[PDB]
Design a protein around this ligand. Sequence first.
Ligand SMILES: CC(C)CN1CCc2cc(O)ccc2[C@H]1c1ccc(/C=C/C(=O)O)cc1
Ligand SMILES: CC(C)CN1CCc2cc(O)ccc2[C@H]1c1ccc(/C=C/C(=O)O)cc1
Lengths: 228, 228
Amino acid sequence: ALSLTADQMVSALLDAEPPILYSEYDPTRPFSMMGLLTNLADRELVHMINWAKRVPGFVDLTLHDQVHLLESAWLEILMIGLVWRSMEHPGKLLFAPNLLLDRNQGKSVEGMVEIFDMLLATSSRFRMMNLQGEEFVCLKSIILLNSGVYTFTLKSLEEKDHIHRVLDKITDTLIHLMAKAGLTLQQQHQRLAQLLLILSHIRHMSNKGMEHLYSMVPSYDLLLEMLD
Amino acid sequence: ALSLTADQMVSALLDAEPPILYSEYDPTRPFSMMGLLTNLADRELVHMINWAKRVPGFVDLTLHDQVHLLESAWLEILMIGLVWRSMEHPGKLLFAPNLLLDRNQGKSVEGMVEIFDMLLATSSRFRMMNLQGEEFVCLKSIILLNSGVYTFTLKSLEEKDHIHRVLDKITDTLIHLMAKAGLTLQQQHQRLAQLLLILSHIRHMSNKGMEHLYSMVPSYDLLLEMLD
Ligand SMILES: CC(C)CN1CCc2cc(O)ccc2[C@H]1c1ccc(/C=C/C(=O)O)cc1
Ligand SMILES: CC(C)CN1CCc2cc(O)ccc2[C@H]1c1ccc(/C=C/C(=O)O)cc1
């Protein structure tokens, strides 16, 4: 994992990409939103576990640490996936190819339109930056490794060190992608910063989303069971 | 602001630094924690407004946008300040020079020890990275400009553009500080990323903190009044 080249890292992440799932509803029947979104999120989680195990360095960690990282990051990962899927659909959120929802549709649940608006704005930011697929997969892997790394013994110190080393490799990779695309050294650092700063907003969105869900979520046990 | 050199940006930010305030309690009297922390935060906010107005580019924005940015960022700014103050005090949070609290003291309020632990871990991360004062002031300014920029008309488009341009200048500045300190180009990008990724955790901490406070906060009107 730490011996991978930038090109190899990118290829590994692109290969690890999960599929785009569909919403489960009878399309011949008349058009609950939260039920549809929950069932979709449930099914995506399984594929996210598989994806996570294919992110270089991730399976080198202890099971306990893998669970902690996924516990911290899962909603951020679903959200960045959603925002990426929605990028070329101004004003809409592509939850699934058969479930493309606008802001007005979000108003059907109390507190939801606020979250829809933040996701739509992130998609807008992605569009304005012209985010590339190779950059997106790097960012999603960064979320997985970074979100829980500040909230964790000699083994723990080794785990955190490894995580930072893998994150450094992904940073190198992002820069390499920007250098290959022809950006100047200045533009490279600037774009790196712009991309990483969006991750703070994705964290914010996830926290707001978790508040919504807790006001009504995969347990440590379910995640542990799925990862073990 | 956009014509400032890296050295000028750093100097401007160092000059803008607010003072370290003291907790208001009778030190001759026997040792409420939340009351002490709230009163401290109240007084710090006033100085934060002054500081914000001295961050290059900030007063170029509309009053409304200044308020929005501060509304989004104020707790993150208090927290990064706290973590910086605490950096050379392992296991303790230096809320003020006369109010140095350990994790055990946080247990006196339900839900607080969790927040103390996250802040202490961030201080630990700062210590391990050997964060420099010049880097800290850059990061605090980045929080101010970035935290609310995704949640905002032709004027709004101009405002967001300006904010991104100022953020790009601060990125250039951070890199310049790392280049002057003798880091390689690789190390520069890596450290930039490490620093910006901590900001995601600071956002997380602020969200957790706001949840605590809302379960019991400066209004738009107070912030507007103070900024106007
Ligand atoms: C209020 C948010 C949590 C709604 N999110 C937005 C992000 C997102 C992305 C997806 O790609 C699929 C669904 C969603 C939904 C969502 C809705 C419900 C749940 C609930 C999960 C559970 O209760 O286990 C999770 C996410
Ligand atoms: C639970 C957290 C919000 C406690 N924080 C931690 C960060 C911090 C940094 C400071 O430098 C000073 C105080 C604090 C406290 C804190 C406590 C109360 C309030 C309340 C403010 C209000 O009610 O206006 C804000 C922050």
